[PDB]
Design an enzyme around this catalytic site. Structure first.
Site, PDB file in Angstrom:
ATOM      1  N   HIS B  43       0.810  -1.211   0.000  1.00  0.00           N
ATOM      2  CA  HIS B  43       0.000   0.000   0.000  1.00  0.00           C
ATOM      3  C   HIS B  43       0.850   1.270   0.000  1.00  0.00           C
ATOM      4  CE1 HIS B  43       0.183  -0.246   4.559  1.00  0.00           C
ATOM      5  NE2 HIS B  43       0.300   1.062   4.387  1.00  0.00           N
ATOM      6  N   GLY B 145       2.646   5.741  10.131  1.00  0.00           N
ATOM      7  CA  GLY B 145       4.020   5.648   9.682  1.00  0.00           C
ATOM      8  C   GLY B 145       4.750   4.388  10.113  1.00  0.00           C
ATOM      9  N   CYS B 147       3.971   1.249   9.343  1.00  0.00           N
ATOM     10  CA  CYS B 147       3.885   0.075   8.491  1.00  0.00           C
ATOM     11  C   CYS B 147       5.264  -0.279   7.937  1.00  0.00           C
ATOM     12  CB  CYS B 147       2.863   0.318   7.365  1.00  0.00           C
ATOM     13  SG  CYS B 147       1.205   0.268   8.032  1.00  0.00           S
TER      14      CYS B 147
END
Lengths: 302, 302
Positions: B43, B145, B147
């Protein structure tokens, strides 16, 4: 539902690169290698037949630089000087640690959290975080061979070393030295029974946890009722709580939630008599192992 | 008195040296740099206006190697290839990580513990340990932030990567990907409501904790009464417990304490109806966040 709180330690790489093994005769434990200095507990000098009443001054005099073998396995570091600072040895080695981080030495205070790197034979084996208890012990996880494991906090890139492990008390808790060589509390680095002061709830950390609950939508315990800091602190002395001393970190939580400190001091007084079958963040007892800073950082991103 | 149990993470240095920042347009998160490969959540490709129903196949086709900027700040790594594996991207870079540890990729199972290195903008910020819940979530600590933060276990010197962070569910828990690209459980990497399966008590970890209690001199709940594994597992299905599957690690605890598994399965059945105001290792509820291995290692030194 889940609080978003975990026991969070600093990343340990910077400190892993400073751990060494120190051997002195039949004793082996861990040391911390910074610049040309290796710090380790002074009871590395002590034969096991003497751990209950060592004469450390005589032991130190009996040592030569040959008496210490320092190894890194993550090099053999030749000892070229030795000195004692309180309950720590300062060994001078011929090679400066090329991975020495920016660092300071500080003393940690009751209720404050720090990170520990548990090491055996100079090999880092795990990391965890603890709060210094009001009786200058920590509820750690340390086995034989763990002495010399270090505790630290981090400000920016600067590692603030605050703890070097020494002892496990009869009740399973742990204590050690600051890098000025003092033992925390009234403890001595002698293998004999020692009085343990009473532990206490860390009021400022209970306040933090109750704010964490509010930040998670859990506020059933918040009422208009208030208790002043002065009145709470009188109460605390009779009920095994620390006296509360507010901080800028707690103030930020009061601002964000719109709930005043004095409202939570009253909540604590009532919760201490019983939760009446209700839960706060999954618990039916007060939690004092998270700090105001933990809550600000982990939940609010500060 | 203190159990000697803490939430223990692996030392994180080996993994810290593998973390990078990945940027794709308006999105930035963390990646894992091993050999000539950088892994990150797919993503990163997704504009924010499309996070609820991305077309990842079309996004991938729209990318060129220029579409990804990879930086290490602990180098700029030039991307020379890109591919998608399930919910992860595999970016090929022109430089092999000189600090690549020995590693494997594995999937972690419910009840098992692993270590997480929480990172923001490619910078490691903390480490913690979690158990994979029976509903394939974890009770972590992750903000915007985070991920691309990774979870891993360690066997010897070999790091077994098992988790790459993706999502925070409505109830505050977390989930992510294995490095085969699957999401854990039935989750999808789309920013929409998703059904959450029921969580359950991890029976084998409750058994471990009760052994930890016995290893600490706390055995008031041990009786001659026994419940068989087959009979407990029928009961578990009606009471939100996992079915118990014994292991060599649990057997070692049974041997050391002289208390049989079936005695603790009966204890669990009774404790679940209430502790009757007694405590076990400071708790008035069953604890399932410590594994048999945790107890063997932290208390028994195995």
């Amino acid at each position: 539902h889940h609080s978003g709180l975990v026991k969070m330690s600093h990343p340990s790489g910077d400190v892993e690169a400073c751990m060494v093994q120190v051997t002195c005769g039949s004793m082996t434990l861990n040391g911390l290698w910074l610049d040309n200095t290796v710090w380790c507990p002074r009871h590395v000098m002590c034969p096991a037949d003497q751990l209950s009443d060592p004469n450390y001054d005589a032991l130190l005099i009996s040592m030569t630089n040959h008496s210490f073998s320092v190894q890194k396995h993550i090099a053999n570091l030749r000892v070229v000087g030795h000195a004692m600072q309180g309950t720590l040895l300062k060994l001078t080695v011929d090679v400066a640690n090329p991975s020495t981080p920016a660092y300071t030495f500080t003393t940690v205070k009751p209720g404050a959290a720090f990170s520990v790197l548990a090491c055996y034979n100079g090999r880092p084996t795990g990391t965890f975080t603890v709060v210094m208890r009001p009786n200058y012990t920590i509820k750690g996880s340390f086995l034989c061979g763990s002495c010399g494991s270090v505790g630290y906090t981090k400000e920016g890139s600067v590692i603030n070393f605050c703890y070097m492990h020494q002892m496990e008390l009869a009740n399973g808790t742990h204590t050690g030295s600051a890098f000025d060589g003092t033992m925390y509390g009234a403890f001595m680095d002698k293998q004999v029974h020692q009085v343990q002061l009473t532990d206490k709830y860390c009021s400022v950390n209970v306040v933090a946890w109750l704010y964490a609950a509010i930040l998670n939508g859990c506020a059933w315990f918040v009422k208009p009722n208030r208790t002043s800091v002065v009145s709470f602190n009188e109460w605390a002395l009779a009920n095994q709580f620390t006296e509360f001393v507010g901080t800028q970190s707690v103030d930020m939580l009061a601002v964000k939630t719109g709930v005043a400190i004095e409202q939570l001091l009253y909540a604590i007084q009532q919760l201490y008599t019983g939760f009446q079958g209700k839960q706060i963040l999954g618990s039916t007892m007060l939690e004092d192992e998270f700090t105001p800073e933990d809550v600000n950082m982990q939940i609010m991103g500060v």
